[PDB]
Design a binder for these strands. Structure first.
Lengths: 387, 387, 387, 48
RNA sequence: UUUUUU
RNA sequence: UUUUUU
RNA sequence: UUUUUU
């Protein structure tokens, strides 16, 4: 097989190509230090190389009440090492200021003077879990962009307020504070991974913050991987016997698209139980799953998927997938109509029952037209906002 | 076999024909030294024989936080040695100036006076990882040339800015700074290999810079090797049973082209998991894969590939592949039309489903004509810019 | 077999009939000495018996950073000895002038006064690797002659400038400097062999100069041995089952030509992995492969090859191969036409597919006529330049 | 060339311009067997 | 003596 | 020498 | 680069 040359360097074995060591502090006033960290986040000051340390401090405070040794024995730390990420316990005796935690060295003097410039206020009420839940609110639609993330965050804040779960400070609702939090989450990997791990792997015991985190992790599944969802749910049909390819996916080019897409999916499934969050966590083979490696397959799959759900009509694409998308949409609409009225007879039903079901199917179809057209109008409003 | 005489000296065994030793420095202020290195890069001063040392210093700072011993035990250093490239740890006690690192010797006095001429500024914010990601931005379309590389770099900077991942200094956006970075990357092998290794082999844990590097490595796959892609995806067709040769590739000359191309591909696949980056890294048997050893096969394969994807219509060729390229393009367009309407009947489908699918295939064909013509017009604009 | 008497003295066993010893110097300022060597090359002064010493010094500086002991343990030195070529390490304590390296003796006083006449300039920027790459530029088309070599050198300098790989001094671009470099390469064997060895056997790690050297070595394959290429690719056809002789090669004389040519090819393949560079390196049985031992076979093979590639129409021959060359060219053109339209039916194809392929084959044939006629016109221009 | 161009006109009239259909036509079947044959030669560009 | 393109 | 899109 | 709803 010389066609293996095309797949060289895609699904490589696991090797560690880095060495990162995040200092974790065994202190007495863990809550007080975490409040200081939240306050420096609120101040807008960027954390240089200490973002990992302080955000992992917040995560350890939330999950383990402030005992970093338990975290070093946790499965999250077990996963992170083996990818080159390690943690040090350093006992701190007295911590009067947040600058005691950061050590002396090059480029830490630059941060230390700024942090000593900030004047904190003692006994802040905001806990680390509150910040972790607020940060988790950003995980859905984070790969989409800043504004979409902020819009989803405001919506989900409303939702969680009307459940009575949480009460975020009104200064967190500001646009700028969300700007700084979005930047902090986007750049930092360990915070996102820890949020994902605690959301996924907590079987019970959720407090308000854990409930919010788990909900946002569940909503973050396959964010940035709509191509995987559309292809695997519609184009690669799943039958009782085997796997049929969609009627619209018979083109000679689309067959090659399918084989390459499969190879990329073997690459993705190597990140077991973390593949849904690959684009969020920027895992290895996520660039192998893109719109542009698979133009025909992407447009056709999204068009076929749009023909079923009225909400997928709001998905935007580049200039070059639009026409093939709606061509596939109308093709699949007509095919679904034909399949609709074709297998009623295959079921044993009276004239009366089939008659009622035909009325129901027509009614459902018009409801779907209502909804798809409404979503299209809302999307047109969104683009008009962009204009 | 006397025909083996033609293949003598092509796929030779692995032997080490060189001895290179890059000094790596175990220092205290690794970040400070790396900032000095980035500043001397920004100054435009060319690094004579120390480019390898300082760029590997930047890579060690990024990957291993500044511990070169871990790098000497890394698999990248394991690969490099055995190709004749070794590293020395030399502990430096005090480093007040960047000139302390470079040792006394012939032709180093020339560089030392220039580096002492430059006046640095303390506490530069730019980290080594930022420079590594910016340098990685150049890897796609680096073998193409300087302007195409710079254009891709600007595009990808825009893309990475709108994700919120990174924020490059505005002085890096200048044309001249990209000129110096392009020159530095083009001449230096170890920097490119280290970027390729960290992009390929990092399974998880990506920060912003690692995400950018991995994305650009994934985009750099088979850059400069479009002939391999076109031939192996279209001319050497892959069936369930065996390997069919394309109908357009039956000529007696093209058969010899195919055998020679195969031999070159056994040469290429010897660089396992690095064959995609052969032209970038200038590996052994990459000159055996060229347009000019395989004129008929190159033109025919690119023409056949252009008949499928609308984006491949933008690929330029020499004066002598153009006519055969479009001849093959029209031949494959007509053949794909005939195959298109020929295997609809081979599938069990109703009159209705086949009718809908024929409408879909026609619609797809006109979309493809739109896109190919647009790409051709854009290419005409590009040549007009050249004029 | 009395016909063995004709082959006596052609494929003889390996014996050493010489004793050459090149002094190699273990010095401190290897780069400084190599710059002096490059400057004496630039001065145009001919090197008497020291050309081998200084050029091997440059090669050792390039490959091994200046440690000749590593070179003496290198496989290139292993190959050279056993052919009668050895090296001495002589440690030099202080080298203020290039004349310190050359020892006192007969005919070295003549060179020493001239080298002391030349006034060097300290700290020359030109490295040994740059000179080695520039010298390697001459290897393709070196056996052809001086002007063709210089033309190829200028073309390849342009090519390597537009890649951004290298920047040769503008004083090297002069015609006279290329004259001196051509003479130096032509006379000297060890320089050419070392360039060939490093180009062939370096699997990875190429810097700019190594990339240039490897490219020119790959382009130098079978330079001066077009007869081997033409015969083995066309006249001695390679089938799945066995070896067919070309229809044009059935003459009773051409059969003897084929047997003698085979014997010469067993002679050539004895130089394993170096047979492609036999005429360049003037290996043992290269005079047994000539135009003049095989007049009929040479002319017929080149004519048959010209019928396939449009570029081989530019190959010149003596007064006496021309008419047989074009006679074979037209014979093979008609035969290829007949074979062309004869095996379309042998493949299972529709009327439509065969029709399209016939259009494609006609279009390809007219493109080939365009290209062959253009090459013929360019060749006519070349002869007019000679006139 | 009178035969060539007039048969070109006849092929254009009867078969819309596809000479292969004419070579499979019964008129061409009759003509050959009387010694009259036709060659398809594809022309790429015809400005004159 | 070699003659092309790479 | 490479030439597209990613 | 991602673009929906959750």
């Amino acid at each position: 097989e010389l066609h293996g040359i095309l797949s060289l360097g895609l699904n490589v074995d696991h090797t560690i190509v880095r060495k990162k060591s995040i200092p974790l502090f065994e202190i007495g006033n863990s809550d007080q230090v975490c409040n200081w960290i939240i306050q420096i986040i609120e101040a807008g000051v960027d954390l240089q190389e200490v973002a990992d340390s302080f955000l992992t401090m917040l995560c350890v405070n939330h999950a383990y009440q402030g005992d970093p040794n338990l975290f070093l024995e946790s499965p999250a730390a077990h996963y992170l090492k083996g990818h080159g990420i390690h943690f040090e316990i350093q006992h701190r005796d007295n911590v009067d200021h947040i600058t005691d935690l950061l050590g002396v060295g090059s480029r830490d003097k630059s941060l230390r003077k700024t942090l000593s410039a900030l004047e904190f206020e003692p006994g802040g009420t905001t806990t680390a879990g509150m910040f972790l839940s607020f940060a988790s609110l950003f995980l859905p639609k984070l790969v989409v962009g800043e504004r979409a993330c902020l819009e989803k965050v405001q919506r989900q804040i409303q939702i969680h307020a009307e459940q009575g779960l949480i009460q975020y400070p009104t200064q967190w609702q500001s646009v700028g504070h969300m700007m700084v939090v979005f930047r902090l989450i986007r750049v930092n990997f360990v915070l996102k991974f820890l949020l994902v791990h605690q959301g996924m792997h907590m079987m019970a015991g959720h407090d308000a913050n854990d409930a919010i985190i788990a909900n946002s992790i569940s909503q973050t599944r396959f964010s940035g991987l709509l191509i995987v969802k559309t292809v695997l749910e519609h184009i690669l049909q799943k039958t009782e016997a085997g796997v049929q390819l969609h009627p619209l996916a018979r083109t000679s080019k689309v067959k090659g698209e399918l084989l390459a897409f499969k190879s990329a999916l073997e690459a993705l499934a190597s990140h077991r139980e973390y593949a849904p969050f690959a684009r969020l966590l920027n895992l290895s083979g996520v660039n192998n799953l893109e719109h542009g490696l698979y133009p025909q397959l992407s447009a056709i799959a999204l068009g076929v998927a749009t023909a079923h759900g009225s909400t997928l009509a709001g998905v935007n694409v580049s200039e070059q997938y639009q026409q093939l998308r709606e061509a596939a949409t109308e093709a699949e609409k007509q095919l679904q109509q034909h399949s609709e009225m074709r297998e009623l007879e295959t079921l044993g039903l009276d004239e009366q029952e089939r008659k009622i079901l035909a009325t129901f199917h027509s009614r459902k179809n018009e409801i779907n037209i209502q909804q798809t057209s409404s979503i299209l109008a809302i999307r047109k409003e969104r683009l008009r906002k962009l204009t």
